[PDB]
């Protein structure tokens, strides 16, 4: 049932370290690889920078003819000699704080204007930002592939070379995330028009959905600027769908080119999203890959985990990310393509004793493999670093292969993983709680994000009060998921799109965090789920609109729900918990015919009900809470207990986090202390001391 | 010449604890006070909530007639019986996570619309946010003062009562900041129009400064929306100056009302600005008090310190805040009106082992007094909690008066303070580095802030490239001040406004982080500083404009500088350090005349020079760096060493922070480990080494006699 990497027909914990040959003295390449191997790591990972090897147009150096660190062939041979598999990442973009994000200077100087990403006025966004589907860009990329891919092909495991996986490009769409700016290159906009014509067929159909007044598709302009009208919201929503298709078109062109060289190894991509040590934005980035993940079961997405520290401040981020990736990519192992080792930023410290606990928490939280990024520090050759001379700090090895504090922590964790991997990889958590992932709430990287300074989405201007980003970040990510993890309740996430009703019936509860909009398919799915016997928890709104904000009241009608939206005090009472602070003055006040009122405004109006519908159960809360008080944990705890869901253990100290992972034969209990306090506690099924910011793992035979 | 509190002609370290009588069972008030006193605390501090005591309009209960915890009179009497002095804080605002920020429900229901703070459209910003100078608001505030101030007056120290200090209102302007919006109430707009007429006298004089074409003062409207023209920037700048006068008018009215009751105790106010465990925006909030601190030498401002954790992520916030308060308020002790104890937010943990280190680091960083907030947890009675029933978590005492983990941390810190206060309060650090505080760069809370929704200031649209908020946050607060603390170089901060030259002359170096604009007074001051023998470090720009962005080339001319602004790679070389990453493509390129070139662009163009001018030294860097790489600390270290400034200690681990505080009698060495690593190191005085092991996120204090 578990998904995991495999070696010699047995479960294999992928342990890789990132070592950038192009940033290390070649005299020390062997020493880096030997020290990596000696930690118990089985794989080494690097970019192959296009700028580094195509030194001028049509002049390629893979053998160290012009600089000894351009000897890619020697580095591959060393990986084989030192019994390490190799992950290669030839771009064309690598980012990696490399000048021009890895693109050659000669390419960027030569490209015509129409090869660049352009703003709505036709101006170049950045001198290093190409348009992904530019003919000229793809032509040069293809010429780079024609030289590097025969080398990669020749050194695959299949040919007793070390190469086992390859990454296509790097964080596709990342530049639109960081800036909040879309590419308005006329070629992109022409592909958007085709997408829209393809989707709606006729201008009449588009006009009926958008409430627009176009006489033809010729009137249609790409959305830009702030959303003022529901028709702007519609146009922006489809612009987001378009970019998901556009990224799939791009990765598909790279993939087919790569396969033409007989490269049959596993292909990968990588998901960014961590900011200042939390990852509440990373699900937005996962959502940009929805079309790739639907159309390429054979490309494995891995996570970029950048916790920076390890405490209760960010304890929930890595589990929520790992669970959401599992939801969106069920047939591949959850792995960290970039797994924090040292720090990209000198002023942002990465302590060995923090990251050691992160590595163990990552096991508790279901990771099946990872690539220490960066295992080895680098020195940028001759000014090629976007920033300073040095690449990463407080790594396992410095650029000269000196061992640093993190080295012994990685060796310790790796020793544990190798000892346990056969059993640990085959373990799962028993989740009786399912939490819905409704991707359209996440489709906002161009209009609402933590990195977008000037917000283009202001839902009050559209006659709405529940912002999808506030809902997904504060109510879902930092609220419900943080609360369940804090309370030591297992949850799974499920992608509600094309979701199998049968998979939902495993669970005792399905939690849906709902805004005022939800498409007909999902409203019908949730109707069927309850009617057939499911227990649904739905807040803060019964939705009444579809994704285009047109009337859609299927769930409301199927459930016999009537409500008025009314202003009251932020505080409500729910299930006899007084003074529950809620996010909004506006709440849904429910008719309680055939219902049991279970939440009340300061004036005692009914803002929550329970109801039997068919064979199932509905709990509807007309108010938004996350986790910003002890009453919020008390409410989550009461809701879970409505369907008699129990934690696996009684642990005497409620601030100890635990995860029970088991299979038929084996149980692992992971105890995690996310607090600056030496804690002593006892546990039983439903007396140990753990240092601050530390862990303990117990094995039980069943 | 340290500033410290004095009790009975001796240095006294003010140790207060916050205990909310209105949130504690009155049967347990005495136990809270006794347990606070047994920590060595000398004072207790509390709000007196208007909403709690004026239970309906003109219905006052201070005696526990309608609820036992309304018995203020009994709480005051218990403070005196348990030998604690009392700080009282009657508002009208208290915030305190109390419903409606402490304002009565009946008042907010009753007030007409023109009592409230309004957006430019004329809509109520928030149903609990009044306009400070609303006539209606002040009429009711005065009726509340008429009832609470006689009680406060009767129980003052001079009448053998326990009351030694009183706070006026609470964090003035904290809602113009957190709401994310400016107050356009017509009382405010009409005071602004008066302020402008008084400032400029004639529409022609205003038009000459703004470059506007108004026919009369009646054509001038309060600025709103984004800054697109330099005239919009000028209007907003004066609007910032006006708000500083407005807050001074508000506090002045409260103070004059208070003094009429025969209240002669020390008056206080409290500075907000921490959020998410950093205080990089606090200097903006303290700048909003510039006119209060000039007009009211008798009102002592204290800091509201909310670190939440204690690590290298926020190590520099408290010291930079303490230094900036000292710059703005040099004639009073640096103290924390609210000094984090426990957590206001259940989900934001406060560990005893973090806060204990914070307390010792605060001592190293020059704090002279503090009020643990919250010493005692409270339970909100009668639904009065803004956000839930429980007020604070992980405090020294729970609401029931049980000791929690933090109680022994506070006892330990207080015991050290009581043993050492006589010498410790008199100790100074030897600062050879002075950093200039140029208040106008901070005057942006209406146009550019971490909290403001709409970014209204885009300097590129004004033909500028150095944003004042970017400069003061990243180049100064997170950059230079962070860098100096990390490198263990002592610095002082000086307010450049009406700054005496003779105060600056004791320093080996003056550091000025400059934008393209600087007033003529400051350009002249820095000119005289160097000509008379001062050593000036100036970056990232020689300014060429004044506060209204009109030509002012005084400092450029006085220093015989010629430059052109040119685009190049972010990377420069400086003092032989290669690949120094700088914030801007644009750099100042200097003529090499009568100077040594010490920084170069990727095209080897000169972007920094050193020269001798009169008796003084000038170092100009035409590029912007904070602390975002190791090259940045190397560069700060090189600049400090130009004048042979030395650290007080050789320490074998560069990641250990230390402060040496000394007087004639005594030397204290504070070691601070802001890192999750057990560190073993050795040290010695710059003029046999001692070995020390320090736990993660911990401290050591060594006392030397002589
Ligand atoms: C208005 C509430 O003010 C609170 O929260 C602010 C943000 O963290 C702090 O800066 C203030 O000191 C605190 O009083
Ligand atoms: Ca009904």
Curated annotation (Swiss-Prot), chain B:
Where is it located? Cytoplasm
Which GO terms label this protein's molecular function in UniProt?
A: hydrolase activity, hydrolyzing O-glycosyl compounds; metal ion binding
Thermoactivity: Optimum temperature is 55 degrees Celsius. Stable up to 60 degrees Celsius after incubation for 1 hour.
Residues the record lists as binding beta-D-glucose 2: 353, 356, 698-699
A Gene Ontology biological process noted in the UniProt record is:
carbohydrate metabolic process
* Entries under InterPro entries matching the protein: Class_I_gatase-like (IPR029062), GLMA-like_second (IPR054746), Gly_Hdrlase_35_cat (IPR031330), Glycoside_Hdrlase_35 (IPR001944), Glycoside_hydrolase_SF (IPR017853)
Name recorded for this polypeptide: Beta-1,2-glucosyltransferase
């Amino acid at each position: 049932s578990e998904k995991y990497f495999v070696k010699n027909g047995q479960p294999h914990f992928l342990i890789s370290g990132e070592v950038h040959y192009f940033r290390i003295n070649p005299k020390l390449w062997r020493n880096h690889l030997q020290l990596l191997k000696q930690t118990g790591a089985d794989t080494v990972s690097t970019y192959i920078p296009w700028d580094w090897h195509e030194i001028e147009e049509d002049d390629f150096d893979f053998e160290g003819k012009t600089h000894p660190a351009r000897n890619l062939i020697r580095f591959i041979k060393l990986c084989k000699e030192e019994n390490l598999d190799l992950i290669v990442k030839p771009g064309p973009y690598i980012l990696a704080e490399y000048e021009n994000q890895g693109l050659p200077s000669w390419l960027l100087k030569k490209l015509s204007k129409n090869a660049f990403a352009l703003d709505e006025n036709g101006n170049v966004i950045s001198p290093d930002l190409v348009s992904y589907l530019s003919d000229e860009f793809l032509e040069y990329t293809f010429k780079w592939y024609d030289k590097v891919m025969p080398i990669i092909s020749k050194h695959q495991k299949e040919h007793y070379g070390p190469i086992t996986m390859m990454q296509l490009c790097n964080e596709i769409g990342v530049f639109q995330w960081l800036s909040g700016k879309s590419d308005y290159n006329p070629k992109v906009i022409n592909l958007y028009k085709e997408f829209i014509i393809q989707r709606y067929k006729t201008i009449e159909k588009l006009n009926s959905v958008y409430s627009t007044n176009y006489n033809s598709f010729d009137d249609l302009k790409a959305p830009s600027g702030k959303i003022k009208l529901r028709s702007d919201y519609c146009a922006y929503f489809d612009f987001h769908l378009f970019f998901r298709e556009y990224y799939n078109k791009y990765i598909s062109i790279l993939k087919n080119k790569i396969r033409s060289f007989g490269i049959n190894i596993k292909l990968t991509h990588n998901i960014p999203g961590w900011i200042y040590g939390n990852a509440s934005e990373l699900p937005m980035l996962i959502s940009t890959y929805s079309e790739i993940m639907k159309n390429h079961p054979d490309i494995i997405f891995g996570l970029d985990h950048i916790p920076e520290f390890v405490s209760f401040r960010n304890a929930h981020s890595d589990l929520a990310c790992n669970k959401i990736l599992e939801a969106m990519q069920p047939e591949a192992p959850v792995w960290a393509a970039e797994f924090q080792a040292g720090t990209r930023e000198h002023h942002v410290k990465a302590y060995a004793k923090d990251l050691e606990t992160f590595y163990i928490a990552s096991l508790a939280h279901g990771i099946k493999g990872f690539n220490y990024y960066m295992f080895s520090q680098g020195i940028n050759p001759e000014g090629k670093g976007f920033y300073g001379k040095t690449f990463y700090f407080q790594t396992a090895l410095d650029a000269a292969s000196n061992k640093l504090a993190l080295y012994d922590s990685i060796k310790k964790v790796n020793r544990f993983i190798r000892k346990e991997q056969k059993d640990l990889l085959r373990t799962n958590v028993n989740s009786e709680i399912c939490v819905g992932f409704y991707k359209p709430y996440f489709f906002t990287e161009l209009i609402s994000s933590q990195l977008l300074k000037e917000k283009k989405l202001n839902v009050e201007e559209l006659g709405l009060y529940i912002d999808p980003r506030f809902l997904r970040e504060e109510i879902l990510f930092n609220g419900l998921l943080r609360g369940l993890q804090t309370l030591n309740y297992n949850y799974d996430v499920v992608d509600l799109e094309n979701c199998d009703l049968k998979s939902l019936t495993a669970y005792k509860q399905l939690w849906i965090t709902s805004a005022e909009f939800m498409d007909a398919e999902t409203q019908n799915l949730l109707s069927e789920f309850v009617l057939n016997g499911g227990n649904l928890i739905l807040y803060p709104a019964v939705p009444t609109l579809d994704n285009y904000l047109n009337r859609c009241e299927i769930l409301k009608n199927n459930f016999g729900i009537e409500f008025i939206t009314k202003d009251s005090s932020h505080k409500v009472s729910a299930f006899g918990i007084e003074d529950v602070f809620t996010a909004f003055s506006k709440k849904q006040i429910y008719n309680d015919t055939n219902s049991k009122p279970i939440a009340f405004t300061q004036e005692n109006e009914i803002c929550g009900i329970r109801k039997k519908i068919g064979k199932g159960e509905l709990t509807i809360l007309g108010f938004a809470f996350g986790y910003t008080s002890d009453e919020h944990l008390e409410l989550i705890d009461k809701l879970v207990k409505l369907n008699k869901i129990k934690r696996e253990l009684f642990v005497s100290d409620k601030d100890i986090q635990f995860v029970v992972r088991e299979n038929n034969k084996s149980r692992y209990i992971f105890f995690l202390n996310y607090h600056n306090e030496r804690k002593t506690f006892n546990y039983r099924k439903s007396e140990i001391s753990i240092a601050p910011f530390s862990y303990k793992v117990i094995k039980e035979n069943k």
